[PDB]
Design an enzyme around this catalytic site. Structure first.
Site, PDB file in Angstrom:
ATOM      1  N   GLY A 185       0.926  19.454  46.302  1.00 41.65           N
ATOM      2  CA  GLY A 185       1.296  20.848  46.530  1.00 41.65           C
ATOM      3  C   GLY A 185       0.553  21.563  47.646  1.00 41.65           C
ATOM      4  O   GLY A 185       0.697  22.774  47.792  1.00 41.65           O
ATOM      5  N   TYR A 229      -9.805  12.101  56.892  1.00 41.22           N
ATOM      6  CA  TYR A 229      -9.325  10.950  57.655  1.00 41.22           C
ATOM      7  C   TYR A 229      -8.856  11.371  59.040  1.00 41.22           C
ATOM      8  O   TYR A 229      -8.161  12.379  59.188  1.00 41.22           O
ATOM      9  CB  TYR A 229      -8.176  10.310  56.886  1.00 41.22           C
ATOM     10  CG  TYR A 229      -7.829   8.894  57.233  1.00 41.22           C
ATOM     11  CD1 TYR A 229      -6.901   8.618  58.236  1.00 41.22           C
ATOM     12  CD2 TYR A 229      -8.376   7.826  56.518  1.00 41.22           C
ATOM     13  CE1 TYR A 229      -6.554   7.313  58.548  1.00 41.22           C
ATOM     14  CE2 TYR A 229      -8.027   6.516  56.815  1.00 41.22           C
ATOM     15  CZ  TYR A 229      -7.120   6.271  57.833  1.00 41.22           C
ATOM     16  OH  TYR A 229      -6.772   4.984  58.144  1.00 41.22           O
ATOM     17  N   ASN A 246      -7.406   2.234  59.171  1.00 40.47           N
ATOM     18  CA  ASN A 246      -8.530   1.804  58.330  1.00 40.47           C
ATOM     19  C   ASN A 246      -9.490   0.880  59.076  1.00 40.47           C
ATOM     20  O   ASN A 246      -9.091   0.213  60.040  1.00 40.47           O
ATOM     21  CB  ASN A 246      -8.031   1.121  57.051  1.00 40.47           C
ATOM     22  CG  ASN A 246      -7.321   2.072  56.098  1.00 40.47           C
ATOM     23  OD1 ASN A 246      -7.417   3.295  56.214  1.00 40.47           O
ATOM     24  ND2 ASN A 246      -6.604   1.502  55.139  1.00 40.47           N
ATOM     25  N   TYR A 247     -10.748   0.841  58.631  1.00 37.75           N
ATOM     26  CA  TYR A 247     -11.778   0.012  59.274  1.00 37.75           C
ATOM     27  C   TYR A 247     -11.384  -1.452  59.414  1.00 37.75           C
ATOM     28  O   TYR A 247     -11.581  -2.032  60.477  1.00 37.75           O
ATOM     29  CB  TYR A 247     -13.119   0.090  58.543  1.00 37.75           C
ATOM     30  CG  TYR A 247     -13.844   1.411  58.642  1.00 37.75           C
ATOM     31  CD1 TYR A 247     -13.921   2.127  59.848  1.00 37.75           C
ATOM     32  CD2 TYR A 247     -14.497   1.924  57.530  1.00 37.75           C
ATOM     33  CE1 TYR A 247     -14.608   3.334  59.917  1.00 37.75           C
ATOM     34  CE2 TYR A 247     -15.178   3.126  57.584  1.00 37.75           C
ATOM     35  CZ  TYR A 247     -15.232   3.821  58.775  1.00 37.75           C
ATOM     36  OH  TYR A 247     -15.917   5.004  58.815  1.00 37.75           O
ATOM     37  N   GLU A 285     -17.394  10.290  58.397  1.00 39.44           N
ATOM     38  CA  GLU A 285     -18.387   9.763  57.450  1.00 39.44           C
ATOM     39  C   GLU A 285     -19.603  10.666  57.345  1.00 39.44           C
ATOM     40  O   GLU A 285     -20.150  10.853  56.261  1.00 39.44           O
ATOM     41  CB  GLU A 285     -18.814   8.330  57.778  1.00 39.44           C
ATOM     42  CG  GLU A 285     -17.681   7.314  57.803  1.00 39.44           C
ATOM     43  CD  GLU A 285     -17.055   6.981  56.455  1.00 39.44           C
ATOM     44  OE1 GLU A 285     -17.310   7.666  55.440  1.00 39.44           O
ATOM     45  OE2 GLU A 285     -16.273   6.011  56.426  1.00 39.44           O
ATOM     46  N   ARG A 310     -18.612  13.464  55.140  1.00 40.65           N
ATOM     47  CA  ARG A 310     -18.568  13.002  53.749  1.00 40.65           C
ATOM     48  C   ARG A 310     -19.947  12.812  53.115  1.00 40.65           C
ATOM     49  O   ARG A 310     -20.116  13.052  51.918  1.00 40.65           O
ATOM     50  CB  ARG A 310     -17.797  11.688  53.646  1.00 40.65           C
ATOM     51  CG  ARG A 310     -16.302  11.786  53.888  1.00 40.65           C
ATOM     52  CD  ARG A 310     -15.719  10.393  54.054  1.00 40.65           C
ATOM     53  NE  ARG A 310     -14.318  10.452  54.459  1.00 40.65           N
ATOM     54  CZ  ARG A 310     -13.746   9.624  55.334  1.00 40.65           C
ATOM     55  NH1 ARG A 310     -14.447   8.650  55.909  1.00 40.65           N
ATOM     56  NH2 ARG A 310     -12.467   9.770  55.643  1.00 40.65           N
ATOM     57  N   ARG A 330     -29.229   4.315  70.506  1.00 40.56           N
ATOM     58  CA  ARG A 330     -28.078   3.775  69.795  1.00 40.56           C
ATOM     59  C   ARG A 330     -28.469   2.590  68.919  1.00 40.56           C
ATOM     60  O   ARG A 330     -29.352   1.801  69.277  1.00 40.56           O
ATOM     61  CB  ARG A 330     -26.953   3.395  70.766  1.00 40.56           C
ATOM     62  CG  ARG A 330     -27.245   2.242  71.720  1.00 40.56           C
ATOM     63  CD  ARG A 330     -26.058   1.956  72.624  1.00 40.56           C
ATOM     64  NE  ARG A 330     -25.892   2.986  73.649  1.00 40.56           N
ATOM     65  CZ  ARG A 330     -24.773   3.215  74.332  1.00 40.56           C
ATOM     66  NH1 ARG A 330     -23.675   2.499  74.111  1.00 40.56           N
ATOM     67  NH2 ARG A 330     -24.751   4.183  75.237  1.00 40.56           N
TER      68      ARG A 330
HETATM   69  N1  LIG Z   1      -8.864   6.687  60.951  1.00 36.12           N
HETATM   70  C1  LIG Z   1      -9.738   6.694  59.922  1.00 36.12           C
HETATM   71  N2  LIG Z   1     -10.380   7.841  59.566  1.00 36.12           N
HETATM   72  C2  LIG Z   1     -11.262   7.861  58.530  1.00 36.12           C
HETATM   73  O1  LIG Z   1     -11.840   8.926  58.229  1.00 36.12           O
HETATM   74  C3  LIG Z   1     -11.529   6.685  57.823  1.00 36.12           C
HETATM   75  N3  LIG Z   1     -12.395   6.603  56.786  1.00 36.12           N
HETATM   76  C4  LIG Z   1     -12.573   5.426  56.159  1.00 36.12           C
HETATM   77  C5  LIG Z   1     -11.887   4.264  56.550  1.00 36.12           C
HETATM   78  C6  LIG Z   1     -12.083   2.959  55.833  1.00 36.12           C
HETATM   79  O2  LIG Z   1     -11.372   2.014  56.150  1.00 36.12           O
HETATM   80  N4  LIG Z   1     -12.984   2.863  54.859  1.00 36.12           N
HETATM   81  C7  LIG Z   1     -13.320   1.688  54.066  1.00 36.12           C
HETATM   82  C8  LIG Z   1     -13.040   1.881  52.597  1.00 36.12           C
HETATM   83  O3  LIG Z   1     -13.430   1.026  51.817  1.00 36.12           O
HETATM   84  N5  LIG Z   1     -12.375   2.983  52.239  1.00 36.12           N
HETATM   85  C9  LIG Z   1     -12.019   3.313  50.858  1.00 36.12           C
HETATM   86  C10 LIG Z   1     -12.570   4.725  50.586  1.00 36.12           C
HETATM   87  C11 LIG Z   1     -11.860   5.824  51.358  1.00 36.12           C
HETATM   88  C12 LIG Z   1     -12.303   6.197  52.637  1.00 36.12           C
HETATM   89  C13 LIG Z   1     -11.638   7.210  53.336  1.00 36.12           C
HETATM   90  C14 LIG Z   1     -10.539   7.859  52.762  1.00 36.12           C
HETATM   91  C15 LIG Z   1     -10.102   7.499  51.484  1.00 36.12           C
HETATM   92  C16 LIG Z   1     -10.766   6.486  50.783  1.00 36.12           C
HETATM   93  C17 LIG Z   1     -10.535   3.180  50.598  1.00 36.12           C
HETATM   94  O4  LIG Z   1      -9.757   3.007  51.564  1.00 36.12           O
HETATM   95  O5  LIG Z   1     -10.124   3.250  49.419  1.00 36.12           O
HETATM   96  N6  LIG Z   1     -11.023   4.298  57.589  1.00 36.12           N
HETATM   97  C18 LIG Z   1     -10.815   5.456  58.245  1.00 36.12           C
HETATM   98  N7  LIG Z   1      -9.963   5.528  59.278  1.00 36.12           N
END
Ligand SMILES: Nc1nc(=O)c2ncc(C(=O)NCC(=O)N[C@@H](Cc3ccccc3)C(=O)O)nc2[nH]1
Length: 262
Positions: free
Chosen positions: A45, A75, A117-118, A172, A175, A192
């Site tokens: 919502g 994200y 995602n990573y 991150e 967070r 770095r």
């Molecule tokens: N583009 C991008 N922005 C982010 O903020 C981000 N933040 C996180 C990851 C990522 O793979 N994280 C590894 C992981 O294990 N993530 C968990 C926890 C999570 C992280 C971020 C958002 C939601 C859940 C999941 O996917 O379940 N990838 C991202 N990619």
């Protein structure tokens, strides 16, 4: 959408701290705070006009890119550099619709076929997070790499690496106060370094930590969560209490249970 500005040009601990605090302030209200830890808005919502924030990154090279962050999870969903915008492959139709509300005046719109995602980004980069250096220098370079992607100057592995840098230093850090602290250290000394296991395991566990805290019995976890110390050794988390100085924001999982007061 609200815009938060940061520059790597002459960045200090204070200017970075101000930036991360401002990002957190735009990501969350004070409406949902559980065991002193703020929760991001519920996706369900959530009006589209409240869905995103914009992070305008500038560097010493006088280049700017704008990242779009989803407020529900912090994200990075995509970015704009001048007359081009690029979005990661959306998870669902709702998210695909949502991103049409971003950078609406831009001449060239692209959606990547790959997710953000990573795991996917590391594959494309040819390097894991543990082997990608973070700090002001990496961020300065990442901004330039994102800027030059549309004109052919940036190879895909470099772009992926640059996303990995931006995500950790912005999302991150927002967070986790712990990760913010790790970036502050790098900025302070202008040195770095790749993230150690304490950073990696926190990143990987954000979703699980959010759920465990929200599902907890008065703060007590039903199942412990294993993290790692700086040296790679195990750290067991049994309770929200130990996480209060570590985690700054949680993804929404559920409405909190009724006030447990005796
Ligand atoms: N583009 C991008 N922005 C982010 O903020 C981000 N933040 C996180 C990851 C990522 O793979 N994280 C590894 C992981 O294990 N993530 C968990 C926890 C999570 C992280 C971020 C958002 C939601 C859940 C999941 O996917 O379940 N990838 C991202 N990619």
């Amino acid at each position: 959408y609200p815009i938060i500005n940061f520059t790597t040009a002459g960045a200090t601990v204070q200017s970075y701290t101000n930036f991360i605090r401002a990002v957190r302030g735009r990501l969350t209200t004070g409406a949902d705070v559980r065991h002193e830890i703020p929760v991001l808005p519920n996706r369900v919502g959530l009006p589209i006009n409240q869905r995103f924030i914009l992070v305008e990154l500038s560097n010493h090279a006088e280049l700017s890119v704008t990242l779009a962050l989803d407020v529900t999870n912090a994200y990075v969903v995509g970015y704009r550099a001048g007359n081009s915008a690029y979005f990661f492959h959306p998870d669902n139709q709702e998210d695909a619709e949502a991103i049409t509300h971003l950078f609406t005046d831009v001449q060239n719109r692209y959606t990547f076929a790959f997710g953000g995602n990573y795991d996917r980004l590391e594959q494309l980069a040819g390097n894991l997070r543990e082997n990608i250096e973070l700090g002001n220098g990496p961020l300065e370079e990442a901004i330039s790499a994102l800027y030059y992607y549309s004109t052919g100057g940036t190879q895909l592995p470099t772009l992926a690496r640059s996303f990995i840098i931006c995500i950790q230093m912005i999302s991150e850090a927002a967070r986790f106060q712990y990760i913010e602290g790790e970036m502050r250290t790098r900025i302070r000394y202008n040195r770095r370094s790749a993230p150690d296991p304490s950073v990696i395991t926190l990143e990987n566990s954000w979703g699980r930590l959010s759920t465990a805290i929200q599902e907890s019995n008065q703060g007590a976890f039903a199942s412990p969560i294993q993290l790692q110390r700086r040296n790679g050794s195990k750290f067991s988390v049994y309770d929200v209490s130990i996480l209060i100085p570590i985690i700054a924001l949680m993804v929404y999982r559920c409405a909190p249970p009724p006030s447990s007061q005796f």
